[PDB]
Amino acid sequence: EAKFTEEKILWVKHHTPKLITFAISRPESYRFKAGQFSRLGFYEGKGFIWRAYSVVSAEYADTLEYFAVLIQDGPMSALFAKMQQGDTILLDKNATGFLLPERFPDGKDLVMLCTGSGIAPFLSILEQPEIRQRFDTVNLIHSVSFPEELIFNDRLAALSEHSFRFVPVTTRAANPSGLSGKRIPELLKNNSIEQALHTKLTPESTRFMICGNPEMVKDTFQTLLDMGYAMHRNRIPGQIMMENGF
Ligand SMILES: Cc1cc2nc3c(=O)[nH]c(=O)nc-3n(C[C@H](O)[C@H](O)[C@H](O)COP(=O)(O)OP(=O)(O)OC[C@H]3O[C@@H](n4cnc5c(N)ncnc54)[C@H](O)[C@@H]3O)c2cc1C
Ligand SMILES: [Cl-]
Ligand SMILES: [Cl-]
Ligand SMILES: [Cl-]
Ligand SMILES: [Cl-]
Ligand SMILES: [Cl-]
Ligand SMILES: [Cl-]
Ligand SMILES: [Cl-]
Ligand SMILES: [Cl-]
Ligand SMILES: [Cl-]
Ligand SMILES: [Cl-]
Ligand SMILES: [Cl-]
Ligand SMILES: [Cl-]
Ligand SMILES: [Cl-]
Ligand SMILES: [Cl-]
Ligand SMILES: [Cl-]
Ligand SMILES: [Cl-]
Ligand SMILES: [Mg+2]
Structure with a gap:
């Protein structure tokens, strides 16, 4: 089927104004090896935006967690700055x-x-x-x-x-x-x-x-x-x- 699934933002934590960790729902089928990265995305109008993030959570955890630095004028960073619990985020089915x-x-x-x-x-x-x-x-x-x-x-x-x-x-x-x-x-x-x-x-x-x-x-x-x-x-x-x- 599709190359990604629709997941949900579970929570966003500000450690500083510009450093966040956040968790998303994890499908049963999503496998990765510790050290690998996901590709996360959003629907933007009729198109997409995609970026890579290393998984910070454990291979055995029941959610996926990420650590992002918010970049001035960065397009994904602007979306991360506005997202909140319950919003849709896209998860590429493959970790790399x-x-x-x-x-x-x-x-x-x-x-x-x-x-x-x-x-x-x-x-x-x-x-x-x-x-x-x-x-x-x-x-x-x-x-x-x-x-x-x-x-x-x-x-x-x-x-x-x-x-x-x-x-x-x-x-x-x-x-x-x-x-x-x-x-x-x-x-x-x-x-x-x-x-x-x-x-x-x-x-x-x-x-x-x-x-x-x-x-x-x-x-x-x-x-x-x-x-x-x-x-x-x-x-x-x-x-x-x-x-x-x-
Ligand atoms: C394999 C891989 C793994 C990555 N893992 C992470 C991760 O775990 N956490 C994370 O925050 N980002 C990570 N990145 C970067 C991430 O994909 C985005 O580029 C970042 O979230 C900024 O997106 P943006 O659209 O706001 O800016 P972009 O348009 O992607 O980037 C604008 C500029 O910001 C700078 N920049 C981008 N990301 C960073 C960063 N993390 N630290 C410092 N300067 C940066 C670069 O100078 C870049 O040219 C990874 C990238 C790759 C290729
Ligand atoms: Cl939140
Ligand atoms: Cl540290
Ligand atoms: Cl100092
Ligand atoms: Cl300085
Ligand atoms: Cl796994
Ligand atoms: Cl190996
Ligand atoms: Cl040696
Ligand atoms: Cl070499
Ligand atoms: Cl974890
Ligand atoms: Cl750095
Ligand atoms: Cl250094
Ligand atoms: Cl910046
Ligand atoms: Cl550099
Ligand atoms: Cl410098
Ligand atoms: Cl949404
Ligand atoms: Cl070799
Ligand atoms: Mg394993």
């Missing part, structure tokens, strides 16, 4: 994406590097019980500009205290819980992330996932290549998986 951590072998140290809304797929991955079982440590570094944008900080700091480590990074504001004033590629170069994790990072033992703004993803990838890491490919184990967050 290759941020699939179980393609890395058990026993490694998993290091997730993200910016902004790029934390979203890693939230779903952290809800998989087997991820902290399979990997020796699970580490999440979330870079934003200002500490107000660390909207999962209280939750992830509490989970932090097979260890889970959370390192917040604020690139434009000085936060005397994490690291401040520098972006993730620089913090890899100067060993600050390794020091914050209290875990030596090596190509043999570390496996990276990257999700963030395109410039950060590129700069982080190139930095890791300089440090001796390689992309995961079909036949290459490698140490890096990456996806642009927009």
Whole structure:
């Protein structure tokens, strides 16, 4: 039949004026792997608008949750700003994406590097019980500009205290819980992330996932290549998986 279903907005939560999470109804048939993204849409007049969002809720949850940043003059953002419980939202029947951590072998140290809304797929991955079982440590570094944008900080700091480590990074504001004033590629170069994790990072033992703004993803990838890491490919184990967050 159609390539999508009509779902309902269940609720919208403002964490700041411009950062929302929201939940939608989940059809019985909708399957995804943690780390993948949905395509969400609205009827607009006689046409459509569609955008991709990483699922932030657990694979086993009974709803689908998403984390969206509201962009000035952005067309989907204007619709998100007006939507409310009971409104129709369209859900593409297929989930997509290759941020699939179980393609890395058990026993490694998993290091997730993200910016902004790029934390979203890693939230779903952290809800998989087997991820902290399979990997020796699970580490999440979330870079934003200002500490107000660390909207999962209280939750992830509490989970932090097979260890889970959370390192917040604020690139434009000085936060005397994490690291401040520098972006993730620089913090890899100067060993600050390794020091914050209290875990030596090596190509043999570390496996990276990257999700963030395109410039950060590129700069982080190139930095890791300089440090001796390689992309995961079909036949290459490698140490890096990456996806642009927009
Ligand atoms: C695979 C994939 C996964 C995505 N996952 C998410 C997600 O989990 N959460 C989310 O909020 N967005 C996500 N995005 C972006 C999302 O699809 C939209 O682009 C976003 O909601 C803005 O839509 P818009 O129509 O208001 O603006 P658009 O017309 O789509 O974009 C306008 C401009 O806003 C900027 N922009 C867009 N999205 C972002 C963002 N998230 N952070 C910073 N700047 C941005 C870009 O400069 C873009 O050119 C994803 C995109 C892709 C391709
Ligand atoms: Cl609502
Ligand atoms: Cl599923
Ligand atoms: Cl959930
Ligand atoms: Cl903006
Ligand atoms: Cl509606
Ligand atoms: Cl797979
Ligand atoms: Cl970002
Ligand atoms: Cl956060
Ligand atoms: Cl500034
Ligand atoms: Cl700038
Ligand atoms: Cl400051
Ligand atoms: Cl960064
Ligand atoms: Cl090594
Ligand atoms: Cl960018
Ligand atoms: Cl390459
Ligand atoms: Cl290959
Ligand atoms: Mg499964």
